[PDB]
Write a protein that binds this ligand. Structure first.
Ligand SMILES: NC(=O)[C@H]1CCCN(C(=O)CN2CCOc3ccc(Cl)cc32)C1
Ligand SMILES: [Zn+2]
Length: 139
């Protein structure tokens, strides 16, 4: 679980979105595993606009933050679940670090702000859905 609150928006993993999120839907993309919904309260999370490949993510399964080196956003294949069939997930970044089901929604941040959220992992890896290209989150 976990979300990004920036201005009048809430960014969550699309597979974890609520009925309220869908009733106030702004944009969603199954290929990215993202959904953005509108909010009445003001969010103060700052989104990074950069090409950083180092950052710190929150890992709920360890209740700890971990520093990581991560790859640049790309199309990477993902297995199958009660949420999606076998597919390539776009705008995905990988890092060597611990993650297990339940860690989705954990924020990844660099010195510039919020980079993305945990969306997949396994075998000593962790995958993050990038949000740095969604320039409209800020205006
Ligand atoms: N982005 C997706 O398609 C996700 C949707 C939820 C399910 N997905 C998983 O990867 C589930 N899973 C299995 C392997 O071990 C893991 C370790 C860390 C994490 Cl965060 C998830 C998993 C795909
Ligand atoms: Zn940065």
């Amino acid at each position: 679980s976990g979300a990004i609150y920036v201005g009048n928006y809430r960014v969550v993993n699309r597979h974890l979105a609520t009925h309220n999120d869908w009733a106030n839907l702004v944009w969603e993309d199954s290929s990215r595993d993202l959904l953005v919904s509108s909010t009445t309260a003001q969010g103060c999370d700052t989104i990074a606009r950069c090409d950083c490949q180092t950052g710190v993510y929150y890992c709920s399964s360890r209740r700890k933050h971990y520093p990581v080196s991560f790859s640049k956003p790309s199309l990477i294949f993902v297995e199958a679940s009660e949420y999606y069939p076998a597919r390539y997930q776009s705008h995905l970044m990988l890092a060597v670090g611990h993650s297990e089901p339940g860690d989705c929604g954990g924020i990844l941040r660099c010195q510039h702000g919020v980079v993305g959220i945990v969306s997949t992992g396994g075998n000593g890896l962790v995958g993050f859905a990038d949000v740095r290209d969604l320039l409209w989150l800020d205006e």
